[PDB]
Amino acid sequence: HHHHSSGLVPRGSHMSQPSILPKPVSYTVGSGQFVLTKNASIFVAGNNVGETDELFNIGQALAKKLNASTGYTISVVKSNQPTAGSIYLTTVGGNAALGNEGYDLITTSNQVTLTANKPEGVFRGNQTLLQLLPAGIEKNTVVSGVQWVIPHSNISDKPEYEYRGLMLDVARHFFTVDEVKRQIDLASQYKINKFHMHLSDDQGWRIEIKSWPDLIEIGSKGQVGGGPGGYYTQEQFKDIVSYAAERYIEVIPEIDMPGHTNAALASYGELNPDGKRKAMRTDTAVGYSTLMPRAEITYQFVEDVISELAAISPSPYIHLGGDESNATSAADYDYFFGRVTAIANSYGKKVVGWDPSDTSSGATSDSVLQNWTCSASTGTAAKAKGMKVIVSPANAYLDMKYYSDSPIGLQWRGFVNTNRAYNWDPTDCIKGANIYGVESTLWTETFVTQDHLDYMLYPKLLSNAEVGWTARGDRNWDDFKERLIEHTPRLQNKGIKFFADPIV
Ligand SMILES: CC(=O)N[C@H]1/C(=N/OC(=O)Nc2ccccc2)O[C@H](CO)[C@H](O)[C@@H]1O
């Protein structure tokens, strides 16, 4: 047999017809169609009144999206007796083999029925439902001249990996609550279910800590390149968490330590050996900063930060970073990371950390390794200790330029086009591990505007999202590429300022 790899498309990027991404476990189409009309209602029914109430909220979220593009005023009804023309969302009789996020979605001429095990699965299935309707449905303003049809179809679906995440770096350049919510919303439509906020680094500190107010008064006042920076109040952070929770997205906050800490060191002189505040940094160097690993004030500082963050962050996880502590000795790093893990655990939080944090003698089997290095030796400790692993290989470093000539992005992991972001498997990064899942990391050294974020995340994130959701056996670039071409108008309709990748 004859095989080939993909080159660029001749004559430039290519960038009744559903466009499901990520690819579902099964999808068949039959004769006939459902028509969504102005008289449609969404019916919801759970196994008890509390569950029905939860489904009702999910239903209203779906109605909101449908109403924006159709111009209808679809409303939601608590009833298990849907009427012809209805969408019906239910958890009664879900197929347990599909798990928490799985669902069946069967569209007949008279009715759309989404059957899941849990409300979470209904929400994930609704993302598929939106992709079954015609291009135009994802507009934020009313679209005329499009019949709102869904082909008779049968879908069953569940994720391959439990953790399918996006990290946004808000330290290097700041992004507003509105901007963050928008990225969470867009990502949720592709079944991303985790959002990791990199809230602190050398160039900025972005979360209000009431006990150490100069982290904001001093530490938040800049960013890479000398812009004004910004921060989230604790109320704003709670609002982001709430918005994510409505999309069944867990928010994992990161306070990077003991490295990547210049903003803290610039805020409080007492965190430095000489007692003086560091000058703020607006460059892009990494690796040079460190907390004092053998001073108790360091651990008081960390405890205060963790106490306040834990109080406002419902995720069972806090990310304590641990990357590039090049001004910290191996012995001091081992000791430091063990100490801060104990602090986090005492406040009821399990610790996530970048490699080599798994090597700390103070880690537990409940700690999680975020494996970004993806070398043969990375995560040897994690594996031995039974720690879950989240992979972030080169193919998930979405801040990498698509090509040599990309106008934004870095390139220390090489270029990452839409094909490279697709053509990998989590087992490529690490062998013999309990792989919890994948996280796409959007570092922001070179991204200043919302348009920059859109350009680098789309279509790259779509590739990563499919790697997280769709089983390896059913992933195929030639297939995905053609599906992505078909999906393009939907990106445009959403107002995403995507890159029209010439490999698509
Ligand atoms: C865990 C992690 O990602 N840490 C930092 C970095 N780590 O980047 C490098 O180590 N770069 C590098 C390595 C060798 C040669 C030249 C650059 O990459 C990112 C940009 O992609 C951000 O700067 C992160 O703060």
Side-chain angles (χ1 to χ4, degrees), residues 167 169 172 198 201-202 256 260 284-286 323-324 354-355 372 397 399-400 410-413 441 443-445:
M167 185 206 79
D169 173 1
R172 276 45 180 275
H198 188 83
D201 211 287
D202 291 311
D256 203 337
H260 285 277
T284 61
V286 305
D323 60 312
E324 294 169 342
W354 304 105
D355 66 83
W372 59 295
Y397 262 60
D399 61 316
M400 294 306 113
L410 294 184
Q411 57 185 76
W412 72 270
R413 307 201 78 162
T441 63
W443 304 99
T444 57
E445 274 82 359

Side-chain angles (χ1 to χ4, degrees), residues 12 40 48 137 188 238 271 309 336 338 384 431 454 463 493 502:
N48 48 244
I137 200 72
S188 76
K238 297 190 287 184
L271 294 179
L309 189 55
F336 173 93
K431 300 284 180 197
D454 286 6
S463 296
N493 291 164

Side-chain angles (χ1 to χ4, degrees), residues 294-348:
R294 303 288 174 167
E296 291 302 322
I297 187 62
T298 297
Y299 302 103
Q300 184 57 258
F301 172 77
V302 171
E303 173 156 1
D304 287 338
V305 175
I306 290 175
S307 179
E308 296 201 25
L309 189 55
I312 65 176
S313 183
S315 167
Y317 289 105
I318 182 164
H319 199 307
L320 297 177
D323 60 312
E324 294 169 342
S325 300
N326 301 338
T328 313
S329 71
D332 284 350
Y333 178 88
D334 187 75
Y335 169 88
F336 173 93
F337 215 82
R339 281 202 58 176
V340 303
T341 297
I343 298 169
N345 293 174
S346 293
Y347 285 84

Side-chain angles (χ1 to χ4, degrees), residues 54-133:
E54 189 166 352
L55 297 184
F56 185 82
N57 291 331
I58 293 169
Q60 293 193 130
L62 175 63
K64 182 174 166 59
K65 302 205 97 60
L66 294 175
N67 290 159
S69 51
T70 60
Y72 303 158
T73 53
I74 296 164
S75 67
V76 185
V77 177
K78 299 174 182 179
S79 164
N80 71 347
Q81 298 173 71
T83 245
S86 297
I87 292 162
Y88 183 44
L89 312 176
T90 189
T91 48
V92 179
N95 192 324
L98 303 175
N100 287 357
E101 299 193 87
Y103 62 90
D104 290 306
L105 178 58
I106 298 176
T107 297
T108 68
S109 290
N110 289 138
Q111 186 173 312
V112 174
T113 302
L114 196 170
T115 310
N117 297 301
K118 302 283 273 290
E120 182 178 9
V122 176
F123 178 81
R124 302 289 180 242
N126 279 164
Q127 312 313 304
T128 297
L129 179 53
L130 268 282
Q131 294 171 156
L132 289 177
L133 282 152

